[PDB]
Amino acid sequence: MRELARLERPEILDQYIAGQNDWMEIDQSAVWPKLTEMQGGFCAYCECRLNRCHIEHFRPRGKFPALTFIWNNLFGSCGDSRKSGGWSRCGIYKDNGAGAYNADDLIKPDEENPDDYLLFLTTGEVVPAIGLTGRALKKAQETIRVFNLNGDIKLFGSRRTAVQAIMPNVEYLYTLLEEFDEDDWNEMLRDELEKIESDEYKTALKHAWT
């Protein structure tokens, strides 16, 4: 899960007003390219490469019908209402599978940095970060549970496998720290951390490298 930078708001949300208009009405192809600029073609919560993808209301339209056509509230999530098979993480699970949750106790990736709350182990679990108590623990726990970031076997698998592919390269860089001067070795690590923005599960790869 990444720290997102929400920067410019699209024109079409001005036209549609909550109460009068429904989400079925609004055209979605206007909305996407601004999200795809923010999110880099990756999912908001899990960091899939998006290919089957939907617009998600971070606070849902049932509980919060006021927060409907709000640029803060929208995110591009992996999954699909249409296609067969009940999707089992992220947007879709938050509604259907996760059940009862307080939306106040969830990490919102545009507002907050997730990195202080979440830790990605190289064994492929995501866990609460080292030394959290009270509310900070409760957000970390509920984010993991509600988006199903460990419990989706497909996701747990993909992330574990992606990291375990790079762990020879991580091992090997931190041997060469011995021999080189600082500025060359710091360039090497800068270069590797540059590459992984093109990659899937970029947060988990960061924690492995850094």
């Binding site: 080292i130 076997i153 698998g157």
Partner: protein, 105 residues
């Protein structure tokens, strides 16, 4: 063709998997197509490496008494030439080096 019906047993279409299966590793097909963990979740020993990693990260990368005990358990259970022990060794090496860098900074 994947057959995942609803609780009433009813389905409308059968979908192909997203992953190419032909020539792929079996472990990947287990997880990505059959939706089953490659390691048995009900076995405690399946979680030891994860727990070991967490202990190492809690103690700034140094083998403390608790991490050493678990390391010894991993060694004793899986053996000296096990993939699991090699991964543990790798974790130690990497985390020690990361900590050294942190201290220099």
């Amino acid at each position: 063709r994947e057959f995942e019906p609803n609780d009433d047993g009813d389905q409308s279409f059968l979908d192909s998997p997203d992953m190419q299966t032909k020539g792929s590793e079996n472990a990947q097909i287990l997880e990505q197509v059959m939706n089953v963990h490659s390691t048995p979740p009900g076995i405690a020993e399946s979680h030891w490496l994860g727990n070991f990693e967490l202990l190492l990260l809690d103690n700034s990368g140094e083998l403390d008494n608790h991490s050493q005990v678990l390391y010894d358990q991993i060694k004793a259970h899986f053996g000296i030439d096990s993939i699991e022990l090699k991964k543990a060794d790798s974790l130690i090496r990497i985390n020690k080096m990361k900590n050294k860098l942190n201290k220099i900074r």
